[PDB]
Design a binder for this molecule. Structure first.
Ligand SMILES: Nc1ncnc2c1ncn2[C@@H]1O[C@H](COP(=O)(O)OP(=O)(O)O)[C@@H](O)[C@H]1O
Length: 744
C-alpha cells in the first residue's frame, strides 16, 4: 500500500497527462515554440516561473494561451518540467462560471477537478499543510463575471461561498498562501485590481516566421509538403501574415489540400480564412445552402451564448436551441457539456446568423459598432467578442462574398439592407472614435472591420475630415495582419501621419503589408518589432518614393551588415530625410564602412543613432570621415560601440572640420585617456559642438585635464559628461572646482 497523498499524486498525474496528451495527434510532437515576453532576451516556456504568487499570461484570442497551459500540464504530469510542484490543478473558467451551487476549496479541487480514491479528508489536509508544492491554472479568466458582491474576504477552506469569491481570495493569498497560480486571459479583463497581486505578467504574441515553418514541418510528414506550404506562404504575404497567430497556422495546415490545389487564388482576410474552414467542414457531408439551417441553428446558439457570456452548453440548453446530433457532427461543437471549437468560431457563427437569419432586424446591427432580444443580446455581449463578431459581419458583406450569400437568400433585399446599415456604421466609425476621447485597441478593431468589408471607397470616406498627426499604437498587439488593415485605411490620409508602432510583432511580413500606406507617413517608428534585413531592405526600396517620409526608427531588431547597402542608398538618395535610428542591432565595422558612403553624399540628415551596435574603430573612422564635411547632422550616438582610441582620433579629426554637429554621444566605449586627448585637440578647432557625452570610458584624471585645458580656450561647449569613469574620490572633489561644465 501507499498513503492517500502518494496515491492522489499518482492519480492526478495520470488524469492530467491523460487529458493534456491529445489535441491520432500528439501535443508533444505538435507543440511549437510560442515566444513569451514581459515589461510593462525573450524567455521560453520552460522559464515560466523563475510575495504575490500568481503569474499571468495574456494574449489575443487564438494566440495559443489554452494550448500553453495544456503543455505546462503535459510537461508536469510526465516528469519533464515543473517538477517542483507535487500537485497541479487545471481549471477552465468557462466551466466554473456554470457552477451556481456555492463551494468550499475542497469541493472545488475534488468534485470539480480530481476525486481522490481514498483519504479525502487526510489528503486535503496535506494540501493545506504544504501549499508551496501546489500549482493551480485558470484558463480564460476573461470568461468569468466578477460582481459587486464577490469582493469580500474569506479565508476558510471548508466554508462554502460563491465560485468567484474563491478565486478573488485565492489570488490575494488568503486561500492556499504561497501556492502558485497561472492565469491566461485576453488583454481586456486584466484590470489593476487583479494586477496588484501578480508575480509577473507575460505576453503571448504568436509564432515567429520560423515558428510557422517549424509548426508546418511537425504537422505534415508526407514527403516535402511542409516545403510546398512554406512556398505558398512565401508567395502570399497576406496568408503568411495571418499564420503568425497559431489558430491560423492551424487552419492553413488543416486546409493544406485545397490551398495547394488553387486554382482560384488564396484567401486574404480573416473572414476568408473562416469561410475556407467552413467549406472544409462542409465537405464532410451550392454546398452551403445544403446545410444552411444547421449553421443558423448554431449561429443562434452562438449569438445567444455570446450575449449571455456563456461559452459552454448543457444538453438541456442544446435541445432548447434545437441542435440535433446531425448538426453537432458538422464539428463546430466539441468536447458531455459542449463548447465551440474556439471562441472565434462562436463569433463567426454569431456573425453568420446576424447576416442571414430572418429574425435579425436591420437596426439591431447598429449595436455591433456601438450605434429585439437580438439587440439586447448584443448590448450584454462582451466588447472583445463584439469587436470580433463585427469584423466578421463586415467581411461576410464584402463584395467578394455577394454571391455566396445570394445563394441562401430567396431575396437579396435583406442583404442589401444589412450591407447598407453596416456600411453606414463603418463610415461614421472613425469620427465617432476620435471625437469621444476624454481607446487604441478599439481603434484597430475599427480598422480591422473596414479592412474586412474590403470596399476601398469606404476607407476613404471614413478617414475624410479626420485630423490625425500622431498615431500611437505601441504594445497594441500589432502583427502582419493588423498591418494589412492599417495599410488599407491609412493610405487614404492626406495629412502625413507619425506612425508609432514600437513594441509589437510586425516582423518582415508586417513591413511588407504596411507598404501601401508608407506614402502617408512622415515618420515610421518600428522599435522592438523583430525585423530582419529582408524587411528593412524592402522598406527602403519603397521609402525612396515617399517624399513625405523623413524619420525611420528601428531600434532593437535583427538588422545586420546585410542591410548596409540599402541604408547607403537611403542616405544618398532620399534628400529630405531627417532621422535614422538603428540602435541595438548587429551592425559591425563593415556595415558601418558600407553605409557611410551614403552619408558622405547626404545633405539633410539631422539625427543618426547607433547605440548598441559595434561599429568599432574602422566603422567609427568611416562615419567620421563622412560627417567631416556634412552640413546638417546635429546628433550622433555611438554609445556602446566598442570604439578604441583609433576611432576617437578619427572622430576628433572630424570635429576640426564639422561645423554643424551639436551633440556627440560616446558613453560605454573603451576610449582611454589617449582618445580623450585627441578629442580635446579637436575641441580646440571646433566652435560648434555643444554637448559631448563621454561616460563609462576608462578615463583617468590625465584625460580630464586634457579636456579642461581645451575647455580653457573653448567657450561654445555646454556639457562634457564623465560620470562612471575611474576617478578617485579625491580626484572628483578637484574637478567640481575646476570647471562647471564637467558633468560628473
Ligand atoms: N504553441 C502551439 N503549438 C501548436 N499549435 C498551437 C500552439 N498554440 C496554439 N496552437 C493552435 O491554435 C489553436 C488555438 O489556440 P488556443 O490555444 O486556443 O489560443 P487561445 O487559447 O489563446 O485562444 C490550437 O488548437 C492549436 O491548433
Amino acid at each position: 500500500e501507499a498513503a492517500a497523498c502518494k496515491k492522489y499524486m499518482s492519480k492526478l498525474r495520470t488524469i492530467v497527462a491523460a487529458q493534456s496528451r491529445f489535441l491520432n495527434l500528439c501535443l508533444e510532437d505538435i507543440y511549437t515554440e510560442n515566444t513569451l515576453e514581459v515589461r510593462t532576451a525573450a524567455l521560453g516556456l520552460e522559464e515560466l516561473f523563475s510575495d504575490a504568487d500568481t503569474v499571468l499570461v495574456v494574449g489575443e484570442a487564438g494566440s495559443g494561451k489554452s494550448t500553453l497551459l495544456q503543455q505546462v500540464h503535459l510537461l508536469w504530469a510526465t516528469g519533464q518540467d515543473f517538477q517542483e510542484f507535487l500537485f497541479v490543478f487545471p481549471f477552465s473558467c468557462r466551466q466554473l462560471q456554470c457552477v451556481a451551487r456555492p463551494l468550499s476549496v475542497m469541493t472545488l479541487l475534488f468534485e470539480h477537478c480530481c476525486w481522490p480514491d481514498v483519504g479525502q479528508q487526510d489528503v486535503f489536509q496535506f494540501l493545506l499543510d504544504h501549499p508551496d508544492r501546489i500549482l493551480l491554472t485558470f484558463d480564460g479568466f476573461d470568461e468569468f463575471k466578477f460582481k459587486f458582491t464577490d469582493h469580500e474576504r474569506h479565508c476558510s477552506p471548508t466554508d462554502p461561498t460563491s465560485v468567484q469569491t474563491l478565486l478573488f481570495n485565492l489570488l490575494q493569498g488568503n486561500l492556499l498562501k504561497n501556492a502558485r497560480k497561472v492565469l491566461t486571459s485576453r488583454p481586456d479583463a486584466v484590470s489593476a485590481f487583479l494586477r496588484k497581486y501578480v508575480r509577473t505578467e507575460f505576453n503571448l504574441k504568436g509564432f515567429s516566421e520560423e515558428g510557422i515553418e517549424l509548426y508546418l514541418r511537425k504537422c505534415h510528414r508526407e514527403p516535402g509538403v511542409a516545403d510546398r506550404l512554406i512556398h505558398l506562404l512565401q508567395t502570399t504575404s497576406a496568408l503568411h501574415g495571418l499564420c503568425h497567430l497559431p489558430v491560423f497556422s492551424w487552419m492553413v495546415s488543416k486546409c493544406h489540400q485545397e490551398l495547394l490545389l488553387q486554382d482560384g487564388g488564396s484567401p486574404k482576410t480573416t473572414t476568408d480564412m473562416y469561410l475556407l474552414i467552413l467549406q472544409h467542414f462542409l465537405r464532410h457531408a451550392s454546398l452551403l445552402q445544403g446545410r444552411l439551417p444547421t449553421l443558423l441553428r448554431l449561429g443562434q446558439l452562438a449569438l445567444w451564448g455570446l450575449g449571455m457570456c456563456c461559452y459552454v452548453f448543457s444538453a438541456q440548453q442544446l435541445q432548447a436551441a434545437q441542435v440535433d446530433p446531425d448538426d453537432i457532427s458538422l464539428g463546430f461543437l466539441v468536447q458531455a457539456p459542449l463548447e465551440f471549437l474556439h471562441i472565434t468560431f462562436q463569433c463567426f457563427l454569431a456573425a453568420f446568423y446576424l447576416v442571414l437569419s430572418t429574425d435579425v432586424p436591420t437596426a439591431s446591427l447598429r449595436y455591433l459598432f456601438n450605434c429585439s432580444t437580438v439587440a439586447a443580446l448584443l448590448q450584454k455581449t462582451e466588447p472583445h467578442n463584439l469587436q470580433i463578431t463585427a469584423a466578421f459581419l463586415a467581411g461576410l458583406l464584402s463584395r467578394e462574398h455577394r454571391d455566396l450569400l445570394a445563394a441562401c437568400q430567396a431575396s437579396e433585399r435583406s442583404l442589401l439592407r444589412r450591407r447598407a446599415c453596416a456600411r453606414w456604421c463603418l463610415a461614421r466609425s472613425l469620427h465617432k472614435h476620435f471625437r469621444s476621447i476624454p481607446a487604441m485597441p478599439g481603434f484597430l478593431w475599427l480598422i480591422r472591420s473596414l479592412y474586412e468589408m474590403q470596399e476601398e471607397r469606404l476607407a476613404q470616406e471614413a478617414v475624410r475630415g479626420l485630423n490625425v498627426e500622431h498615431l500611437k499604437l505601441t504594445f497594441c498587439g500589432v502583427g502582419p495582419a493588423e498591418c494589412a488593415a492599417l495599410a488599407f485605411v491609412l493610405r487614404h490620409l492626406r495629412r502625413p501621419v507619425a506612425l508609432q508602432l514600437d513594441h509589437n510583432s510586425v516582423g518582415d511580413i508586417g513591413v511588407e503589408q504596411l507598404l501601401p500606406c508608407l506614402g502617408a507617413c512622415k515618420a515610421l517608428y518600428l522599435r522592438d518589432n523583430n525585423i530582419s534585413d529582408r524587411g528593412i531592405c524592402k522598406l527602403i526600396e519603397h521609402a525612396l518614393h515617399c517624399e513625405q517620409l523623413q524619420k525611420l526608427a528601428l531600434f532593437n531588431n535583427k538588422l545586420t551588415d546585410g542591410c548596409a547597402h540599402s541604408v547607403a542608398q537611403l542616405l544618398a538618395c532620399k534628400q529630405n530625410f531627417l532621422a535614422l535610428r538603428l540602435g541595438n542591432n548587429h551592425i559591425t565595422a563593415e556595415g558601418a564602412q558600407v553605409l557611410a558612403e551614403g552619408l558622405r553624399d547626404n545633405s539633410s540628415l539631422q539625427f543618426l543613432g547607433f547605440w548598441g551596435n559595434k561599429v568599432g574603430d574602422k566603422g567609427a573612422q568611416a562615419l567620421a570621415e563622412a560627417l567631416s564635411d556634412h552640413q546638417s547632422l546635429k546628433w550622433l550616438s555611438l554609445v556602446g560601440n566598442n570604439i578604441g582610441s583609433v576611432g576617437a582620433q578619427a572622430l576628433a579629426s572630424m570635429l576640426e572640420k564639422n561645423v554643424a554637429l551639436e551633440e556627440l554621444c560616446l558613453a560605454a566605449n573603451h576610449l582611454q585617456d589617449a582618445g580623450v586627448c585627441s578629442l580635446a585637440e579637436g575641441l580646440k578647432r571646433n566652435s560648434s559642438l555643444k554637448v559631448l557625452k563621454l561616460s563609462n570610458n576608462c578615463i583617468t584624471f590625465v584625460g580630464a585635464e586634457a579636456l579642461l585645458q581645451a575647455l580653457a580656450s573653448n567657450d561654445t561647449i555646454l556639457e562634457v559628461w564623465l560620470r562612471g569613469n575611474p576617478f578617485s574620490p579625491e580626484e572628483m572633489e578637484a574637478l567640481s572646482h575646476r570647471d562647471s561644465r564637467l558633468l560628473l
